[PDB]
Every structure is written in C-alpha cells, then in structure tokens.
Design a binder for these strands. Structure first.
Ligand SMILES: [Mg+2]
Ligand SMILES: [Mg+2]
Ligand SMILES: [Mg+2]
Ligand SMILES: [Mg+2]
Ligand SMILES: [Mg+2]
Ligand SMILES: [Mg+2]
Ligand SMILES: [Mg+2]
Ligand SMILES: [Mg+2]
Ligand SMILES: [Mg+2]
Ligand SMILES: [Mg+2]
Ligand SMILES: [Mg+2]
Ligand SMILES: [Mg+2]
Ligand SMILES: [Mg+2]
Ligand SMILES: [Mg+2]
Ligand SMILES: [Mg+2]
Ligand SMILES: [Mg+2]
Ligand SMILES: [Mg+2]
Ligand SMILES: [Mg+2]
Ligand SMILES: [Mg+2]
Ligand SMILES: [Mg+2]
Ligand SMILES: [Mg+2]
Ligand SMILES: [Mg+2]
Ligand SMILES: [Mg+2]
Lengths: 119, 101, 73, 88
RNA sequence: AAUGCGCAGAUACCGGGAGGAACGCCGAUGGCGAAGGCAGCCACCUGGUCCACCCGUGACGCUGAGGCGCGAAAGCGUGGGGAGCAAACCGGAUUAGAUACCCGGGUAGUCCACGCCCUAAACGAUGCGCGCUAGGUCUCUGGGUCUCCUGGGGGCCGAAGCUAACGC
C-alpha cells in the first residue's frame, strides 16, 4: 500500500540459496524472498528452480504495492543467478536494466580456508 | 631545490570569499616554505570519478613549483591541515613521455 | 587471429605521464574500472608500466574510477 | 645525494694535478665522502640492512686502496690519512 | 545434514561511523636483490646495477679457514594491537571407531615497536672468479650508421662435447 510503480530488485546469488529483495528507488525494501521463504528446506534453495519462484514470489508481492517496473542488481555467482533474472523478466514487471555488482576486495581479508585454494 | 607539482582539490561549493581565503593560505603556506612558483593552473571544478568527502564534484588546482626537498612533506601536511582541502598530491616534476607521437 | 580494435592506434601524440588528462586516460580502462591489458592497450612493456603509475595517480585525484559496475548482464 | 658541485670540490682538491680524476688519492677521497654520508644515513635508520652491505663494500674498497698506497708511496699515504683523518 | 544465528527483528537492501589488516585490475613469457626475499599511491633518506665517451690511476687483482654481519615461517621476552583468519581447545556431523578430513565457534598466533631465536625442499637439490668452444628463436633494458648492428639480463631449441641415464 504505497504505489511505488518503479523501484529496484536486488538478486543475491549464492551456492547455498538465492534471495531477492525488491526496493523503492532509494534502496529501502518493499518486500523480499528466498528459497526458504518459497518453501524449500536446506539444500534445494540453492537450486535454479528455487530461484525461479523466489524471484516470482518477490515480484508478485511487489505488484501488490503496484510496481510496474524495476532495475535489476545481481550480486553473487551462485547457481540460479540467471533463473532469478529470467523469472523477473517473465514476471510482468518491466526490467529496465540488469547490472552485475558482486563485491570484490582489492585484496583485503584472508579468505576462509575453503576459499584459499593455493597461491 | 627540486621541481615538484602541487596538486590540491578543495571543496566544490564555496564562493569568491571563502574560496579566495583558502587560496590565500595556499599562496601563504607555499611561500613560507621556500617555494618559488614557476607556474599555475586553476582548472576549475570537475566531475569526480567517485564521490570524495561526500561531494560528487571538486574544485581543482595545480601549482608547478621549485622548493627545497627537505621541506616538501611538511608543506604537504600544512597544505592538508584545512578542512576544505580534500586532497593534496605533491609530485616530483618529470619530463613528458610522448607515446604514439 | 584475435586482431580487433586496439587502443594505441585510436589516439595520437599523447603524454604518458599526464595524470590530469582524462578524456585520453579513460580510454585505457575496462568496461568496469579495471586497467586494460597490453593485448588491448597495444602498449610496449615500458609504455604500459607508465600508464599504470599514472592511471593509479589519476585515481587518487578522483578523476579516474577504481572500479565500476557491469551493465546489461 | 652528493651532486656534481660537491663531488667536484673533492676531486679538484685531492687531484694530484689538474685533470686527474682517478688517482688513488682521488678515489680514497671520493669513497670517504661516500662512507661518511652513508654512516649518517645509518645512525638513524638502523634497520636498513641492505644499505649497510653497500657500506661494508665501500669500507672494503677504501682499505684496499690505502693498503696499496701504503706500499707505493708510504709518505704519500701518511699524507692522505692526515688529510682525511681516517684509518686509526 | 546438524550444531549455530534469528520476533530482544536476523538474512537480503539503503545511509552514517569505528577499526584492524591486505593491496584488485595493470600482472607474465616481466623486473630488483648476495641470499632470505621484494609488489596501492606520494615525499624524503639510501644500496646495487647497465650503457656511451675511452678521460684519470697503473696489477691496486681472485679466492677466502677463523671473525663479523644478514637470514621465510614457526617460536620466545616487554609493551601495544586485534578486523579477517586460525594450532590448542569447545561443539555438530561422518564412521565399525574418527582423538581426522566436512560444518558452527574459538585462544595463542597472525599486525606494530624494541630485543632474542638462526632453522628449512634456506633448491637451479648446480661455491666464487676468469679464459675458451656453431647457431636459431622469444623477451626485458641501454647505445649506434636503427632492413639492422652492438652491450647487459631473463627463457626456449640445438653444433661440438659431456653424462649412468635423465639431461646439460
Ligand atoms: Mg533457537
Ligand atoms: Mg513479537
Ligand atoms: Mg549483515
Ligand atoms: Mg553499510
Ligand atoms: Mg574496533
Ligand atoms: Mg619471473
Ligand atoms: Mg637473480
Ligand atoms: Mg624463492
Ligand atoms: Mg643509485
Ligand atoms: Mg684512457
Ligand atoms: Mg702513466
Ligand atoms: Mg628469522
Ligand atoms: Mg614471525
Ligand atoms: Mg610476541
Ligand atoms: Mg591484549
Ligand atoms: Mg572462523
Ligand atoms: Mg574449524
Ligand atoms: Mg603470550
Ligand atoms: Mg621483530
Ligand atoms: Mg630504438
Ligand atoms: Mg643473452
Ligand atoms: Mg650431440
Ligand atoms: Mg645421450
């Protein structure tokens, strides 16, 4: 109940789950979703299917505040990074843009050993 | 006495009063540190790449100077001491390197 | 082949130490902010060494970005 | 850094005759000028070990030329020492 | 999967702040250093090196037992610091068991200053110097009459030759 028409959708990709925040054009959340929210327990969530309904859920929830179109920001390299984007296109929302924006350090903190590989 | 280049980026939105006041102190702080000032370019404000000091713009300067080396670092800090002075980049002067000339 | 558009050809008789020159300097950066590889700058080993030292300097002045954001992904 | 106008003063001084730039005196003199500057650098900056190796070599090149000079002209040696006041 | 975190509202998102640490791209087929080793940017201080001129000294050279200095990491002492990471440790899993690999925590430590320690697959597993003995090709950095010639450095291929062989 706000009538924002336009806003932003942040897709957050990850190997373990995919989550999607929808947001007014200043970055304040309107609604969100993820694979858990959709229904999935541990481990499916990361699946591309999860991300499909995750994104669709979020958009359906945002059509309620009468959104017509959004900008897409995607961060993460997970599975179903794209399926979240496809789903927002076929969502009926108008995707005005897509922008990768996964954060990376200019060599900052020591990774956890699972992300260290070698030298 | 070596040839440097004093780079200074002060706040974008002032006026020919507070701006001319900082200008005064730069001219002041330059000279009182033994810096003759070979030439100058006040290349206006420009749109910054990323926002510095919360401002998307920044007023620029460029004093090509000669001065004793042993007093360069201090000059840079005394240049930096004001709050409306956001970057100071003192660089040793070098001959151009025309490539694809 | 791998012989698309280079950079060194695109411009002319430019100084390689002019960290204040931007419209020239910004031609050597990624779609993002990343400094371009020699295979795409077409600079000599030594030319490219000097490009960094300045593109970096130019970054500190806030004339050149350190990083950006990939459009249309 | 020791620039030209200083290096001159030294050579011109310790030269054996106008134009001599590489006689043992002129070298031992020149080197001594370099050692002294380096030892000051190393009174602060004790942690600069790479430079300290430079100095070990300069000291070594000097005591090498003196060792030669105190065998070719041992009164011309006595004089260089006095003139600098070194090796003692 | 669970432990764990979350309605004292977390995860995702926006703005502001504090801090500790490390410097993406450029970047290697690269460079520097005697070795260990050395990468944001600026300034000062300072070491080694290469080339051209062929100017000066006139065998002043090489090597080097002892000595003296330097020496990744871990480790120690005294203060300081402490973001992330993480021996020990505390838990969740797995398993026949699992004092492990996987998962959630976590202290010393990792960082600084000063002082110790003196080790290593400290490796090219190849001591230093000089002279001699086909070439080709790629590359870093000088010089010149600059299709190329001439130095210094890093690779690859190979003459002679060597090697137990691999190789050189
Ligand atoms: Mg609970
Ligand atoms: Mg409640
Ligand atoms: Mg958070
Ligand atoms: Mg924040
Ligand atoms: Mg803190
Ligand atoms: Mg290499
Ligand atoms: Mg080497
Ligand atoms: Mg090594
Ligand atoms: Mg030097
Ligand atoms: Mg001669
Ligand atoms: Mg003679
Ligand atoms: Mg040690
Ligand atoms: Mg240590
Ligand atoms: Mg300690
Ligand atoms: Mg403490
Ligand atoms: Mg941890
Ligand atoms: Mg653990
Ligand atoms: Mg302790
Ligand atoms: Mg220490
Ligand atoms: Mg040439
Ligand atoms: Mg060679
Ligand atoms: Mg043969
Ligand atoms: Mg054979």
């Amino acid at each position: 109940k706000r009538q924002v028409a336009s806003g932003r959708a942040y897709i957050h990709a990850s190997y373990n789950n995919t989550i999607v925040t929808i947001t007014d054009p200043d970055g304040n959340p309107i609604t969100w979703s993820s694979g858990g929210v959709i229904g999935y327990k541990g481990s499916r969530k990361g699946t591309p299917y999860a991300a499909q309904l995750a994104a669709l859920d979020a958009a359906k929830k945002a059509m309620a505040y009468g959104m017509q179109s959004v900008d897409v920001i995607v961060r993460g390299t997970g599975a179903g990074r794209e399926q979240a984007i496809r789903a927002l296109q076929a969502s009926g929302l108008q995707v005005k843009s897509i922008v990768d924006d996964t954060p990376v350090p200019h060599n900052g903190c020591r990774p956890k050993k699972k992300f260290r590989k070698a030298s | 006495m070596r040839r440097y280049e004093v780079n200074i980026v002060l706040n974008p939105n002032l006026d020919q009063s507070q701006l001319a006041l900082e200008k005064e102190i730069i001219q002041r702080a330059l000279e009182n540190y033994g810096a003759r000032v070979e030439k100058v370019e006040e290349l206006g404000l420009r749109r910054l790449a990323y926002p510095i000091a919360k401002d998307p713009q920044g007023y620029f300067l460029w004093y090509q100077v000669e001065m004793p080396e042993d007093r360069v670092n201090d000059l840079a800090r005394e240049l930096r001491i004001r709050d409306n002075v956001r970057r100071v980049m003192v660089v040793k002067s070098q001959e151009p390197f025309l490539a694809n000339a | 082949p791998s012989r698309k558009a280079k950079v060194k050809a695109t411009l002319g008789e430019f100084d390689l130490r002019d960290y204040r020159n931007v419209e020239v300097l910004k031609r050597f950066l990624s779609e993002t902010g990343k400094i371009l590889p020699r295979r795409r700058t077409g600079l000599s080993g030594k030319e490219q060494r000097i490009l960094a030292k300045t593109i970096k300097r130019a970054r500190i002045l806030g004339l050149l970005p350190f990083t950006e954001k990939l459009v249309r992904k | 850094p020791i620039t030209k106008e200083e290096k001159q003063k030294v050579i011109q001084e310790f030269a054996r005759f106008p134009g001599d730039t590489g006689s043992t005196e002129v070298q031992v003199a020149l080197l001594t000028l370099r050692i002294n500057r380096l030892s000051e650098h190393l009174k602060v900056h004790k942690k600069d070990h790479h430079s300290h190796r430079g100095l070990l070599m300069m000291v070594g090149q000097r005591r090498r030329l003196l060792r030669y000079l105190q065998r070719e002209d041992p009164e011309r040696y006595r004089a260089l020492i006095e003139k600098l006041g070194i090796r003692g």
